[PDB]
Amino acid sequence: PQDLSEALKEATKEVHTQAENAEFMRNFQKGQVTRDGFKLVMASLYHIYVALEEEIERNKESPVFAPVYFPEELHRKAALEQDLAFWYGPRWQEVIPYTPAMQRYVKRLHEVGRTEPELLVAHAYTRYLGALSGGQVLKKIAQKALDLPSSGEGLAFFTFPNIASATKFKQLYRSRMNSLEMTPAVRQRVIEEAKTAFLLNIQLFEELQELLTH
Numbered sequence: 112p113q114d115l116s117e118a119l120k121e122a123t124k125e126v127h128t129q130a131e132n133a134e135f136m137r138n139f140q141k142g143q144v145t146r147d148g149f150k151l152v153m154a155s156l157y158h159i160y161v162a163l164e165e166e167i168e169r170n171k172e173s174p175v176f177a178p179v180y181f182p183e184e185l186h187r188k189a190a191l192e193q194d195l196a197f198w199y200g201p202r203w204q205e206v207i208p209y210t211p212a213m214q215r216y217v218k219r220l221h222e223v224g225r226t227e228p229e230l231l232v233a234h235a236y237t238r239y240l241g242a243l244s245g246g247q248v249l250k251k252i253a254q255k256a257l258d259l260p261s262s263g264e265g266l267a268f269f270t271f272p273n274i275a276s277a278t279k280f281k282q283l284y285r286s287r288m289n290s291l292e293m294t295p296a297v298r299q300r301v302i303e304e305a306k307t308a309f310l311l312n313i314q315l316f317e318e319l320q321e322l323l324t325h
């Protein structure tokens with residue numbers, strides 16, 4: 112399509128369905144998620160966002176990313192830190208898992224941010240616009256399946272406090288993405304990087320499912 116945001120949505124429809132079909136995601140949707148499984152997911156997210164946000168900060172002023180730099184509205188690291196302290200306890204940093212599949216994703220995020228900056232938008236798009244599109248349904252199924260106490264912690268990651276309206280913000284984020292100037296060659300690389308992001312998530316889901324079924 113014409114708009115980058117429109118191109119991305121179209122090009123990733125296939126892999127997105129693949130992600131929905133992943134065994135781990137299927138069970139999560141079927142309300143079949145265990146606390147051990149959810150903990151692993153949260154640990155994964157922490158590593159992923161730490162890496163992504165480290166690279167976003169590195170390229171914040173670059174013309175290849177600046178247009179989509181929204182630190183206050185989107186940053187998730189602090190929320191995940193809060194959540195992990197609840198899920199793994201006060202010494203969470205020394206006990207949370209960092210698996211090979213998580214490492215593969217983190218490695219690509221750093222490669223992109225350090226040597227292929229123009230593709231970082233593909234990862235920001237996949238993570239942030241994705242969390243803003245179906246994060247409401249995930250949070251719902253989560254709290255209803257984990258039956259956690261009323262301790263007021265554990266799911267901060269699912270709430271973006273600095274965004275008053277998700278619909279309006281997504282419109283703004285899409286507009287900014289479409290404002291980015293890139294050659295047809297780069298545009299193709301960004302589209303392909305978005306598919307790569309989904310694949311990295313899918314391989315992660317597969318690994319997590321394996322770790323939980325021994």
Ligand code: HEM
Nearest residue numbers: 116119120130131136140236237238240241244245309312
């Ligand atoms: C449990 C599986 C999942 C479900 C049920 C789900 C559901 C949805 C829904 C309903 C939309 C469409 C929103 C709309 O346009 O009205 C959407 C969009 C999106 N999802 Fe997912 N999703 C899932 C997993 C993922 C994963 C694993 C990622 C990537 C890490 C992801 C990334 C995205 C992105 C980037 C969009 C934005 C599409 C656009 O540009 O409009 N989703 N998702």
